Structure 1
Amino acid sequence: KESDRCGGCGKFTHEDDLIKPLMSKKKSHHHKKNDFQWIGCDSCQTWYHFLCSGLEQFEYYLYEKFFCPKCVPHTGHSIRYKVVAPHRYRWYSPNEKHLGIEVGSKTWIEDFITRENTVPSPTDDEVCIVEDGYEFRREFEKLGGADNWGKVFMVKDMDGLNMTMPKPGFDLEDVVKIMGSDYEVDTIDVYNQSTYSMKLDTFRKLFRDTKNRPLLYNFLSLEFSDNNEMKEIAKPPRFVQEISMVNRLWPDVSGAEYIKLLQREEYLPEDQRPKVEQFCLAGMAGSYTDFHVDFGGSSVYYHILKGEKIFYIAAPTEQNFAAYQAHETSPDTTTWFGDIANGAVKRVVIKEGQTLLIPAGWIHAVLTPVDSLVFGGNFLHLGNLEMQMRVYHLENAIRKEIRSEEKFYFPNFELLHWMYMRNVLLEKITEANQEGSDMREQEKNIWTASQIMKAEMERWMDRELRLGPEKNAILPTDDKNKIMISVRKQIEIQTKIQNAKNK
């Protein structure tokens, strides 16, 4: 406040500062609108921006009495707000002490832990529990394989999944050693249901302090597909790499084969690649993550390297979506979706070493009973194309009813389908025509996937005519049309081929 200057950047209050897109799960870059919002040292009375105060994003709102770096030595560490309303996200404000218990809050979680064990077990149709990756491959295949993947699998022993994972004993320490101590990761302030920045070192610091945890901290994503060391340490199961649409257009390879497979443009621009297939996840015991459907209706692999998780899940039926949509778009904050989900929500525990494989659309919330380290990834695949498009409808509807903009959605979702259609699907059809082949013979799966995907894209084209292109852009209305035109052309030819067999 006032004319006075900043002890950090020496600037007097100017300022009004408007001085590539996100391809990975990030939500902390939003309240950078506070980085230049002035806090004052209760001691030397010097004013600091915030950024300039030595504070990290996550501690901006924590302190009632602030002591800047130059004062800490003799003043002590800054004094935090008193915990006045443990049952509210704004735990610091007394004006909210009388309001209802909010789903994310400390009070709510503690109580929830006493009653959570009464959430029903899933039916054998919802989840399948196998001993190792060999049994998974056998049962997965016995239900139609990836093209027909509908239930979640829990694999107890990772042997056979062909899934590259660090050896037990691997922990947070190794993570910070590899990524660096100054690597900033999006962290969820569980009790405040909000996401902030935090040095990876700071997190480790807080994580290791076991007896004193005023707040709980889990990190959002931490996607490591671009860290040359990490990216080889934990990988998706082979079967996931073999069906991942992103992996099909931006193939992993990145070795000697990379030089060659891009020597034919079989590798799209790296900045266009969705960055969501390899994430590391650490969480404190007592943590809770509220019900969500994974972005783009992406499938998930989820390996527990350390600790235990309890997942609360609900099958992706239309009613369950409708119910979920209402819950997401409602202002109510005190009701647990499970309690109003007409009995759909089930309970499943995942222990250390165990793995979770989740198909498209499953609604799920997560309880973290024990300090945890997890490795996982999100992927799209043709076997779940319909469900993926259904979730995308759901998301797009939810996005119109409440102004999220902080909510993360699948990066380049549409671009990816244009590319996939043009590079992969169109060629199969084009070629199958060049030989007068009836795709139903040996490629029914591919034929059906093309019609479904095309219909969805036809809807995107028309939307783009009536309303104009999207902000997300990246592919030019013209190119989009040329693609569509060519696709219609080939699908017609293949249709006539199929119809000729009529007599």
Structure 2
Amino acid sequence: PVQAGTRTFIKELRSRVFPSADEIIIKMHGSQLTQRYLEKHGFDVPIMVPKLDDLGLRLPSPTFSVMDVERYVGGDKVIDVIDVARQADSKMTLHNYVKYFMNPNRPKVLNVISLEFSDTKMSELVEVPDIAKKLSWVENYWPDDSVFPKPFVQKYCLMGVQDSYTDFHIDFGGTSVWYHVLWGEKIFYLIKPTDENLARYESWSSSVTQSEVFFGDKVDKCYKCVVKQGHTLFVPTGWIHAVLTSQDCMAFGGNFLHNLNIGMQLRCYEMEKRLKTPDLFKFPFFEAICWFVAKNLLETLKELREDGFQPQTYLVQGVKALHTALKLWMKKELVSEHAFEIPDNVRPGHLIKELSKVIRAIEEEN
């Protein structure tokens, strides 16, 4: 059996000529990627922006090194590191990872993919893509007076050695991600979240043979997307993907929830709860933000209704899925595990009623 992450596994991966991600992604200039464009054409496939012009994305020059990351972050910080050949999570001091990274002879393939630095001096060196900030639920609906700590999942520093490999997964909470390669190269294996593919992914995730079964073989198409230096890739809600560091690489990326695919975001959240995924620990208050969002979406629909307008389809679909999720979390036999995420400022039972009728109305008056 070929174990994910091992040298043998990588020889196969590097030799297969998968369908090109050019068959499904949309390439565009940074100025075309607007909230407006996304609301009209949707955000259903990955978007590639080869040049960073007009993205609003700011970051160190191409010579920024891992040594520099250690300076701005602090070698003492303990970080998650993946022992790729064993597909296991380990720990290290940022200091030793950098020592391991610069050592010409690496006894093992180690990868760093969860280093969030918005709480460090390196944060001032990075401004995330404007589009992420425009769409971000956290940027738009997180109150300045919540008891819940604000989630910081917007700035990650990724460093991996050649052949680092991250197996197929869906970003935590169904978030979308922006990913930029500073230097080196990353190759993404993308899989569309069709109802068939999600189902199989959840089955594959809960099978003991997960590490010996290439998930790419269980679906009709697994798209290969090469992300080269200077390029920026945006992956939308629910997309299943694996990543191969084809060569020593440093990249930056971030996660964000938004209003375009709420249903899918909710679906991914529930799946994660069924699989008991450790990633959910990164967006601990997913439910709290959903409550905050339901208040804002309620307001918009109320404003539109009271003035004779019909909301856009995706907004009605999204609110409907939100309504269903909120009602579920409030069920008598389940509310005890959900109550702590209900914001002080919201009235659960009432917010659900208002939502239920605004929806019903739109359903009848249509």
- TM-score normalised per structure 1: 0.66
Contact in 1 for aligned 2:304/2:310 (Cα 8 Å): no
* Alpha-carbon displacement from aligned partner over 1:126-171 (angstroms, at most 9, x marks no partner): 21223x313545xx855644x7210101111111112122222122
2:358 maps to 1:457: no
Which of 280, 298, 303 is residue 426 of structure 1 equivalent to?
298
- Cα distance change, pair 406–381 in 1 and its aligned pair in 2 (3 A): closer
Residues 1:438 and 2:305 are matched in the alignment:
no
The structure 2 residue matched to 1:127, chosen from 2, 21, 25, is: 25
2:125 is aligned, of 229, 233, 244, to 233
User: Are positions 1:322 and 2:189 aligned together?
Assistant: no
Q: Corresponding residue for 1:97?
A: none
Q: For 2:279 and 2:50, how far apart are their aligned partners in 1?
A: 35
The letter for the 1-side match of 2:25 is V
Partners of 1:152 and 1:202 in 2: CA distance: 35
Residue in 1 that maps onto 2:72: 178
Distance of 2:354 and 2:146 partners within structure 1: 27
User: Using a 3 Å threshold, how does the CA distance of structure 1 residues 474 and 268 change in structure 2: closer, same or farther?
Assistant: farther
Q: CA deviation at 1:192?
A: 1.9
Q: Secondary structure at the match of 1:396?
A: helix
For residues 405 and 448 of structure 1, what CA distance do their matches in structure 2 show? 29
Partner of 2:12: 112
Q: Which deviations, in whole Å up to 9, do the C-alpha atoms of 1:351-383 show, x marking residues without a partner?
A: 001110011011100011111101000100000
- In the aligned structure 2, how far is the partner of 1:135 from the partner of 1:405? 36
Aligned-pair distance for 1:409? Answer: 5.9
Say if 1:305 and 1:397 are closer, same or farther in 2 by CA, change over 3 A.
same
Match of 2:149 among 269, 272, 275: 272
Which stretch shifts more, 384-393 or 315-324?
384-393
The 3-state SS of whatever aligns with 1:198 is strand
Q: Which residue of 2 aligns with 1:335?
A: 213
Aligned residues: 365
What is the SS of the residue equivalent to 1:428? helix
Aligned-partner SS, 2:21: coil
Change over 3 Å in CA distance of 1:328–1:491 after alignment to 2: closer
- The answer to whether residue 333 in structure 2 is matched with residue 466 in structure 1 is yes
C-alpha displacement at 1:448, in angstroms? 4.7
Q: C-alpha distance in 1, partners of 2:244/2:30?
A: 25
CA distance in 2, matches of 1:289, 1:231: 25
Q: CA deviation at 1:269?
A: 3.5
Confirm or deny: 8 A CA contact 2:291 2:342 kept in the other structure: no
In structure 1, C-alpha distance between the alignment counterparts of 2:192 and 2:231, rounded to whole Å: 21
Name the CA shift for 1:406/1:194 in 2 (closer, same or farther; >3 Å). Answer: farther
Return the offset for 1:425. Answer: 2.4
Question: Which amino acid letter does the alignment assign opposite residue 452 of structure 1?
Answer: A
Matched-pair contact (CA < 8 Å) for 2:172–2:279: no
Query: Counterpart of 1:484?
Result: 349
Change in Cα spacing, 1:269 to 1:197, as seen in structure 2 (3 Å) is farther
Post-superposition offset of 1:412: 1.1
CA distance in 2, matches of 1:108, 1:479: 51
Q: State whether residues 237 and 264 of structure 2, in contact with CA within 8 Å, keep that contact through their aligned partners in structure 1.
A: yes
- The offset of 1:398, in angstroms, is 2.7
* Distance apart, 1:272 and its partner CA: 2.6
Counterpart-to-counterpart distance in 1, 2:147 and 2:63: 33
Aligned counterpart, 1:244:
136
Cα-Cα RMSD: 2.8
Alignment of 1:49-448 (within 5 A): 100-109=1-10, 111-116=11-16, 118-122=17-21, 124=23, 126-130=24-28, 132-137=29-34, 144-145=39-40, 148-210=42-104, 212-227=105-120, 229-250=121-142, 266-269=143-146, 271-332=148-209, 333-341=211-219, 343-399=220-276, 405=278, 408=281, 410-422=283-295, 424-429=296-301, 436-440=306-310, 446-448=315-317
Contact 2:175 2:265 in 1 (8 A): yes
What is the CA–CA distance in structure 2 between the aligned matches of 1:331 and 1:353, rounded to whole Å?
A: 38
Structure 1 contact 437–497 (Cα < 8 Å) conserved: no
**SS at structure 2 position matched to 1:188:** strand
Cα distance between partner residues in 1 of 2:287 and 2:279: 19
SS in 2 for 1:347: strand
Between 448-457 and 306-315, the greater mean CA deviation after superposition? 448-457
Q: Give the TM-score taking structure 2 as reference length.
A: 0.89
Q: More relative contact order in 1 or in 2 (CA 8 Å, sep 6+)?
A: 2
Cα deviation, residue 431, structure 1: 5.2
Q: Residues 57 and 130 of structure 2 are in contact (CA less than 8 Å); yes or no, is this contact kept in structure 1? A: yes
Deviations 1:110-131 (A, max 9, x none): x225413x1121353x21223x
Q: Residue 96 of structure 1 aligns with which residue?
A: none
| Distance across 1 between alignment mates of 2:26 and 2:279 | 34
Q: C-alpha distance in 1, partners of 2:8/2:359? A: 61
- SS for the counterpart of 1:220 is strand
What one-letter code is carried by the residue in structure 1 that aligns with 2:8? T
Matches of 2:191 and 2:243, distance apart in 1: 12
Larger radius of gyration: 1
Residue 459 to residue 363, structure 1, CA distance change in 2 (3 Å)? same
Q: Which amino acid aligns with 1:457?
A: L
Which stretch has the larger CA shift, 100-109 or 199-208? 100-109
Give, as a single letter, the amino acid of the residue that structure 2 aligns with 1:219.
V
**Offset of 1:296 from its aligned partner?**
1.0
Structure 2: runs of 5 or more not aligned: none
Residue identity matched to 2:70: V
